[PDB]
Amino acid sequence: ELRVGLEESELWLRFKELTNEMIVTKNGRRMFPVLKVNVSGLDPNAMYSFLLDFVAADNHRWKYVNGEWVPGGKPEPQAPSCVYIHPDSPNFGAHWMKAPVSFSKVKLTNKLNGGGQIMLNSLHKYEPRIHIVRVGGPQRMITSHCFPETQFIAVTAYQNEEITALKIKYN
Ligand SMILES: CC(=O)c1cccc(NC(=O)N2CCOCC2)c1
Numbered sequence: 001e002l003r004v005g006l007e008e009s010e011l012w013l014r015f016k017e018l019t020n021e022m023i024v025t026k027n028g029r030r031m032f033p034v035l036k037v038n039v040s041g042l043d044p045n046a047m048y049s050f051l052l053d054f055v056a057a058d059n060h061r062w063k064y065v066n067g068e069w070v071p072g073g074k075p076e077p078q079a080p081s082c083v084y085i086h087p088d089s090p091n092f093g094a095h096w097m098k099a100p101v102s103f104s105k106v107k108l109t110n111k112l113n114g115g116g117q118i119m120l121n122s123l124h125k126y127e128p129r130i131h132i133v134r135v136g137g138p139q140r141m142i143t144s145h146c147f148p149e150t151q152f153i154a155v156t157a158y159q160n161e162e163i164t165a166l167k168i169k170y171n
C-alpha cells in the first residue's frame with residue numbers, strides 16, 4: 001500500500017488553528033511552511049514524478065473583517081490551479097522514499113507569468129494536493145493526496161499578525 005503522510009503536521013496545525021495565509025507576489029513567493037511529504041510503499045526501481053496543485057476549497061472570496069476571516073462575494077466557479085512538477089522528477093521510488101519530498105522551490109503568484117510559478121487568486125482559500133505519477137512503465141498510474149492541515153488563504157500581505165509572528169518564529 002502506497003502511504004502518503006505530512007511531515008511536521010504539529011507545526012502546520014498551529015498555522016491552521018489561526019487560519020493560515022500564504023503571500024502571492026507578481027514574481028512569485030516561496031511557501032512557509034514548506035509542504036514536506038513522507039512516502040512509503042513505492043516500487044524502489046519504478047519511475048515517478050511528484051506533482052503539486054492547489055484546489056480552491058470553496059467558491060468564495062474571503063476578507064479580514066474585524067480581526068476575523070469571513071466569506072464574501074457571489075459563488076464563482078474556481079478552475080483548478082496549474083501543476084508544479086517537483087524538480088527531482090522524474091526519479092526512482094528509492095529517491096522519493098529516502099527523505100521527505102520537500103516542495104521548497106514552488107512559488108505562488110497572483111499574475112500569469114513565464115513558467116515555474118503557480119498563479120492563485122488572492123483572498124481565495126486553497127488546499128494543497130499532490131499527484132504521484134508512475135511514468136515510463138507500460139501501466140500509467142496516478143495516486144492523489146490532499147493535505148487539509150496545509151489549507152491557506154492566498155494574500156498579497158498578511159492580515160492576522162498571529163500568522164506573521166508564527167512565520168518569523170519558525171522560519
Ligand atoms: C457565504 C457567502 O458569503 C455567500 C455569499 C453569496 C452567496 C452565497 N451562496 C448562495 O447564495 N448560494 C449558494 C448555493 O447556490 C446558490 C445559492 C454565499
Ligand SMILES: CC(=O)c1cccc(NC(=O)N2CCOCC2)c1
Nearest residue numbers: 058059060070071072073074075076
Ligand atoms: C449565504 C446564503 O445566502 C446561502 C448559502 C447556502 C445556501 C443558500 N440557499 C439554500 O440553502 N437553499 C436554496 C433554496 O432552496 C433551499 C435551500 C443560501
